Amino acid sequence: EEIAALVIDNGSGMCKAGFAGDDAPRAVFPSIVGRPRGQKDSYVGDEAQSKRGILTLKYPIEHGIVTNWDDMEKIWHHTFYNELRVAPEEHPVLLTEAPLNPKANREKMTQIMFETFNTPAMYVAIQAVLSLYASGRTTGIVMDSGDGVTHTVPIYEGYALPHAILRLDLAGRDLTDYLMKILTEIVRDIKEKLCYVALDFEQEMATAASSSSLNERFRCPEALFQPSFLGMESCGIHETTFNSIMKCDVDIRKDLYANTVLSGGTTMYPGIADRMQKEITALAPSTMKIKIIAPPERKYSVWIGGSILASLSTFQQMWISKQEYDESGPSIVHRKCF
Amino acid sequence: LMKILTERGYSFTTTAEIVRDIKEKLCYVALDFEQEMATSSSSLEKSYELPDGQVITIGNERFRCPEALFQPSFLGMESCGIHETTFNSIMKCDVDIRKDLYANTVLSGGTTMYPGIADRMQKEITALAPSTMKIKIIAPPERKYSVWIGGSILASLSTFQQMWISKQEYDESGPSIVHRKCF
Amino acid sequence: SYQKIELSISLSLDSPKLDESDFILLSVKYLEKSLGEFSGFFEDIEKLYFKQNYKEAIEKILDFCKKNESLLSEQVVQRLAEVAPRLKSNPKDNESRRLYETLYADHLESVIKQESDLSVFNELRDSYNAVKPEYAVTHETEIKTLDEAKQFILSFVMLNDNVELPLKAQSERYPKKDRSREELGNTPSANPGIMKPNSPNFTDNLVPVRDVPKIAINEKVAGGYSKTKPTTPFVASLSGTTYSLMVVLTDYIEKHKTDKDIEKKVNQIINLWISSYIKEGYHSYSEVVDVLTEPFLQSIFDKANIKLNYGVLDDTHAEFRKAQDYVFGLTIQSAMHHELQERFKNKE
Numbered sequence A: 001e002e003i004a005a006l007v008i009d010n011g012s013g014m015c016k017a018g019f020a021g022d023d024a025p026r027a028v029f030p031s032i033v034g035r036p037r038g039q040k041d042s043y044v045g046d047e048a049q050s051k052r053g054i055l056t057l058k059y060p061i062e063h064g065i066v067t068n069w070d071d072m073e074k075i076w077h078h079t080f081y082n083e084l085r086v087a088p089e090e091h092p093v094l095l096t097e098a099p100l101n102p103k104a105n106r107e108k109m110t111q112i113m114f115e116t117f118n119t120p121a122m123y124v125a126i127q128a129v130l131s132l133y134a135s136g137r138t139t140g141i142v143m144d145s146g147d148g149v150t151h152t153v154p155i156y157e158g159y160a161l162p163h164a165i166l167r168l169d170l171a172g173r174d175l176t177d178y179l180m181k182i183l184t185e186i187v188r189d190i191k192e193k194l195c196y197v198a199l200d201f202e203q204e205m206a207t208a209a210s211s212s213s214l215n216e217r218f219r220c221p222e223a224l225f226q227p228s229f230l231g232m233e234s235c236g237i238h239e240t241t242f243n244s245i246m247k248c249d250v251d252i253r254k255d256l257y258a259n260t261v262l263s264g265g266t267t268m269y270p271g272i273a274d275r276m277q278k279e280i281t282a283l284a285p286s287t288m289k290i291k292i293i294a295p296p297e298r299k300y301s302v303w304i305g306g307s308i309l310a311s312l313s314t315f316q317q318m319w320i321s322k323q324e325y326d327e328s329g330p331s332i333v334h335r336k337c338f
Numbered sequence B: 001l002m003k004i005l006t007e008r009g010y011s012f013t014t015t016a017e018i019v020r021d022i023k024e025k026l027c028y029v030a031l032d033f034e035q036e037m038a039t040s041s042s043s044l045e046k047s048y049e050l051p052d053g054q055v056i057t058i059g060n061e062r063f064r065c066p067e068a069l070f071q072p073s074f075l076g077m078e079s080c081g082i083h084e085t086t087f088n089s090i091m092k093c094d095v096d097i098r099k100d101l102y103a104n105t106v107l108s109g110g111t112t113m114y115p116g117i118a119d120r121m122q123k124e125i126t127a128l129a130p131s132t133m134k135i136k137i138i139a140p141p142e143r144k145y146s147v148w149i150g151g152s153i154l155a156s157l158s159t160f161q162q163m164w165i166s167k168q169e170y171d172e173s174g175p176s177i178v179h180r181k182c183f
Numbered sequence C: 001s002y003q004k005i006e007l008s009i010s011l012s013l014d015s016p017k018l019d020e021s022d023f024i025l026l027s028v029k030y031l032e033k034s035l036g037e038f039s040g041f042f043e044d045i046e047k048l049y050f051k052q053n054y055k056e057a058i059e060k061i062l063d064f065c066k067k068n069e070s071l072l073s074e075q076v077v078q079r080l081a082e083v084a085p086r087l088k089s090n091p092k093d094n095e096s097r098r099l100y101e102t103l104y105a106d107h108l109e110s111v112i113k114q115e116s117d118l119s120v121f122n123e124l125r126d127s128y129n130a131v132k133p134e135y136a137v138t139h140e141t142e143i144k145t146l147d148e149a150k151q152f153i154l155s156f157v158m159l160n161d162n163v164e165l166p167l168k169a170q171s172e173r174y175p176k177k178d179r180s181r182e183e184l185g186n187t188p189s190a191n192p193g194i195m196k197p198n199s200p201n202f203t204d205n206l207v208p209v210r211d212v213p214k215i216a217i218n219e220k221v222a223g224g225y226s227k228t229k230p231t232t233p234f235v236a237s238l239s240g241t242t243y244s245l246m247v248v249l250t251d252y253i254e255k256h257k258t259d260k261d262i263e264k265k266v267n268q269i270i271n272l273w274i275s276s277y278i279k280e281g282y283h284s285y286s287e288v289v290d291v292l293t294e295p296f297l298q299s300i301f302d303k304a305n306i307k308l309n310y311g312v313l314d315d316t317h318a319e320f321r322k323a324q325d326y327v328f329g330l331t332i333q334s335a336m337h338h339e340l341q342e343r344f345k346n347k348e
Helices: A046-050 A069-083 A102-115 A127-135 A177-182 A186-193 A202-211 A237-245 A250-257 A272-283 A298-309 A321-330 A332-336 B003-007 B017-023 B033-038 B061-067 B079-091 B100-101 B119-128 B144-154 B165-174 C005-009 C020-034 C041-050 C056-068 C074-083 C096-114 C119-128 C144-160 C161-167 C242-253 C264-278 C285-292 C295-303 C318-334 C340-346
Strands: A004-008 A015-017 A027-028 A035-038 A055-058 A093-097 A119-125 A141-143 A148-157 A166-167 A261-264 B045-048 B055-059 C186-188 C211-212
Touching: A004 A069, A004 A298, A004 C285, A015 A069, A015 A298, A015 C041, A027 A046, A027 A321, A027 C096, A035 A046, A035 A069, A035 C074, A046 A055, A069 C020, A093 A102, A093 A127, A093 A298, A102 A119, A102 A321, A102 A332, A127 A141, A127 A148, A127 A166, A127 A298, A148 A237, A148 A250, A177 A186, A177 C264, A237 A250, A237 A272, A237 B119, A261 A272, A321 A332, A321 C318, A332 B045, B003 B017, B003 B061, B017 B045, B033 B061, B055 B061, B079 B100, C005 C020, C005 C074, C005 C161, C005 C318, C020 C056, C020 C074, C020 C096, C020 C318, C041 C056, C041 C318, C056 C074, C096 C264, C096 C318, C096 C340, C119 C144, C119 C242, C119 C264, C144 C242, C161 C242, C242 C264, C242 C295, C264 C285, C285 C295
Parallel strands: A004 A093, A093 A119, A141 A261
Antiparallel strands: A004 A015, A015 A027, A035 A055, A141 A148, A148 A166, B045 B055, C186 C211
16 A cells, blocks of 8 residues: 655745645645744744744745744644644655755755655655646746745746746735735735736726725735835846746747746736736737736645646656665755756 | 564564574565565564464565575675575586476475475576576475485385395495495 | 774784673774764664673674675674674673773763762761761861762761661672682782773873772672673672662651752762772772662662662763773784794794
8 A cells, every 4th residue: 555645835935735646735834933932842833823922933934945944844843743644754755946946955855854754755846847747838937926936937848947047036925014005914815805916007097096996906916017016126027027038049938938837826816817918928029929827726736736746657766765865965866856 | 583573673582582483484485575575565464472472573574584595695695595506506517418407496495395485496597597498496395304205215116125235245345335335 | 004903903803802892892993984874873882881781782783784784894794793602701801891981980070070069968968977976977067079078978888787787688689799708918000990900001091009909709609790790890799888878878868858859969979979989999880780779779769759870971982982992902912912922932
C-alpha cells in the first residue's frame, strides 16, 4: 500500500498543504510563528493570531526567501505533525521554491528534511513551473503574485530561464495597508470581497465621480499596474511581462506570448485577464498574437501542480533517496533538481 | 539471524535465551533480493511465540539469512556463493561433459530446504551459463535425509554384496584396502 | 606516512597484554581516523566505557566497522575481528581504565568547583557530630573550598565499624570482598589511581613520589568481587567506609527532606566522595558505586525521592582521548620490548 506523498507550498504568507493527488489543498494555514511577548516555545500559525494580543509574531518567509529556518522547521513540524496528521518519515516530500532562490536555501531545505524530519525522500520545485503544469503547458510565462513577491518567470520547454526571471516585491501585503490610506486584518479581507481591476481607468474614475455605486475597488488593484501608487521605482506588471518576454530569443517569444499564464494569490482579482491583454498586446508587435490564461484556480495553482507532479508515474525516479543525501551531502539537490 | 534480530530489538544472549525454528519455518530465498527488500507493506512479516507467550515478529530478515549463501560478504567472506560455485566447477570440467552436468544440479542438505533455493539458482546459473544450454535444478522434497536415503538404496541392491570389504581381507592388507575397494 | 599509524595498530593490536578495554579505546581512534555523522557512535560507545560495558560496545563497534567497511579497509576489519573473541581482563593489568578514571576525577572536581555553594557540606557536619560524637569533628565554621570539604568528607573513617555495622550486614555483596589479609606493604609510586608503580605515565600526568599501598586479591574467597566484576580496575574489596557516608547521610536526608534542593546537595557530596577517593587511590568508581547501588541503601533515596547521578558526566571525551593515546604508545614500546629480547638472543 504505497505511502502517500506530501506536497507543501510554502507561500509567503499562507501555507497550503496536502497529500498526493488531492483536488484541493487540505491544509491552509498562516505561515507565521509567534511566541509570548499551553506553554509553547513555539506557536505556529493560526493559534498565534488568537493571541495577536500577547505574542511576538514573526514571518519566516519574506519575499519568498526563507529568512528564519528555526521557525520554518516549526511550520513543517506543525504541518506534518498537527495539520496533516502524518508521520513525516512515512511519506515522500515535495517542496516549492521561489524563482531566484539562492543556493543555500536549497541546501538547507534538504538538511532539515533528512535529519530533523527523517523524510523518506525529498524534491524541490519552482513555483512558477509548477503552476504551468496545472494549466498543462510546459512552455510559457507565469506571473505569480503572492502575499509577498510577484515573480515573472519565462520558461522554455519545461525549463525556466534564469537570465530572465524578474522579481518584483509587490504583493497582497503591499496592496493592503494602502487600502487603509485610501479607505480612510479588517482590511485585507475587504480588499478581496469588493475590489476589481478596471479596463479603462480614467474612464472608470469618471464613472466614480458620476455616481456613488461604491473609487477604491479599482484603485487598489491599480497599485499593481501603476506602482507609483506606493512609491515604487518599478513598472507595471504589464511591462515587466513584456520585458521578460523581451529577453528570450526570437524563436521562443512567439509562444511565450501565446502562453502567458497568470498564477498566484493576488491575481484573482476579477478581470485581471483582460487588462493584461490590453496592456501586453498594445505594447507588443502588432503582428503578434497573445493569449493570457488566468485559470480560475490560480490561487492554488502551484500546489495543484505539485500534486499532479507527485502523482506521476515518472516523477517516481527523480526522488532523492536517503542514500543519495548521505552519499552526497546537501549538494544533491543541485544534481537532482534544476 | 541472532545478530539481525538483536539489532531489531529481540535479544538472544544465552545458549538459547529458537532461531533455527525461525530459520526453517519462516525464512525463504528470493529471486531478487532487491524487490523483496522494497516490499512498505509489512506483509512479509510472520510472527511466532516464545515459550511464555511473548510473540515477536520477524521480517526483512526472512530473506537475508538465506542469502548469506548467495552473497556471503554479509558475513565477512569472499567466496561467492552457491550460485557461482556451481558454475566455477562446471567450468573446470570438460566441455564434453558439461551438457550433462548442467541439466543435473541436485540440491541436497538441510540448508536447501529453504523455499526458493531452486529458482534463484535457476536465475543465477541460467544467466551465467551459455545461452544454448538446457537446465533443470532438481530439488527432491526429501532432501533433509537424502544422503542416508541414497545409502539404503545401495545396500538394498543384490549387487552391493560384492563391494563389501570383509574382515578377512582387512587383516592382511590393513586399512589400505579402502583405496582399493572403495573408490 | 599515515600507513605507519595504521600498521602501528595492526601491530598494537597484537600485544600479549591487550584486553577488552584497550580495544575499545584504540579502535575508536582507528575509526575516528580511518574515516575522518558518526559522531554519535563515539559517544554511545563512550557512555558504555564509563559504565564498564565493554562487552556490548566492542561488538557494536565491530558492527559499525563492517557496515561502514566501505570507508574502512579489509585489513582493519580482519584484524579487529580476530582479536575480539579472545578477550578477557585482569584487574591487575587493566591500566588504561585507571588513567581514565584518574583523570575523570579531576574532571568531576572542577565541576564541583563550578558548583558554588559549598554550604551543603557545612550542614553535613551537624549530622556527623550526632553519629559519632565521641569522635566529633570540630572544625572550620565554614568549609569554604573543596579541599576543606574533601578532607573532612574523608574523615568518616572516624565513624567506626561500630556505627556502621547495622548497615554492612544486610548486604549480600560486602561479605564477598576479596582483599587478602596479607600485609604486603607500601610501594612508592608516580600516580595514585594507576597504582601500578611501573606504568607508563606521561610526564604531564605525574604527581609527587607518594608511597602507595600494595594490596593483594584473595582469589579464594568464594564470590570474590574481582571474580564477579573483572572490568573494574583493581579491587580487592568493596567500599566499606561508604557504609559510613550513609549514616551521616541518613540522618541528613531526614532532616533536610524539607529543603527542596537536597537532590542537588546529596549528589554534590556523593560525587565528591567518588572523585577524591579515586584520586587518592583508595578505591575504584565501581567499588564505591556498587555499594550505594544496593537494594537496602537505595531505599533511603527512594523515600525522599532523590535520583542519584553517581558522578556520570557525559562529556568524558577528553579523558577518552587521552587514554587512547596511552595505549598507542604503551603497546608499541612493549611490542618491541621483545624485538630486542629476540635480536639480543641472536648474539648469544
